[PDB]
């Protein structure tokens, strides 16, 4: 796709739940737990 030269690239770890970003992939992982615990059922859906 949009192929070139350019590497040491890192991304911007964005959560797509609440709005957060982090430097590393772990960082984000971890905080997304914040979203996932006991399957605590809500206003999800219904
Ligand atoms: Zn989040």
Same mark, same amino acid.
């Given at each position: 796709?949009?192929?070139?030269?350019?590497?040491? +690239?890192?991304?911007?770890?964005?959560?797509?739940?609440?709005?957060?970003?982090?430097? #590393?992939?772990?960082?984000? #992982?971890?905080? #997304?737990?914040?979203?996932?615990?006991?399957?605590?059922? +809500?206003?999800?859906?219904?």
């Amino acid at each position: 796709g949009s192929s070139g030269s350019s590497g040491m +690239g890192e991304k911007c770890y964005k959560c797509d739940v609440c709005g957060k970003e982090f430097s #590393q992939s772990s960082h984000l #992982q971890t905080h #997304q737990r914040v979203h996932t615990g006991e399957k605590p059922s +809500g206003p999800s859906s219904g």
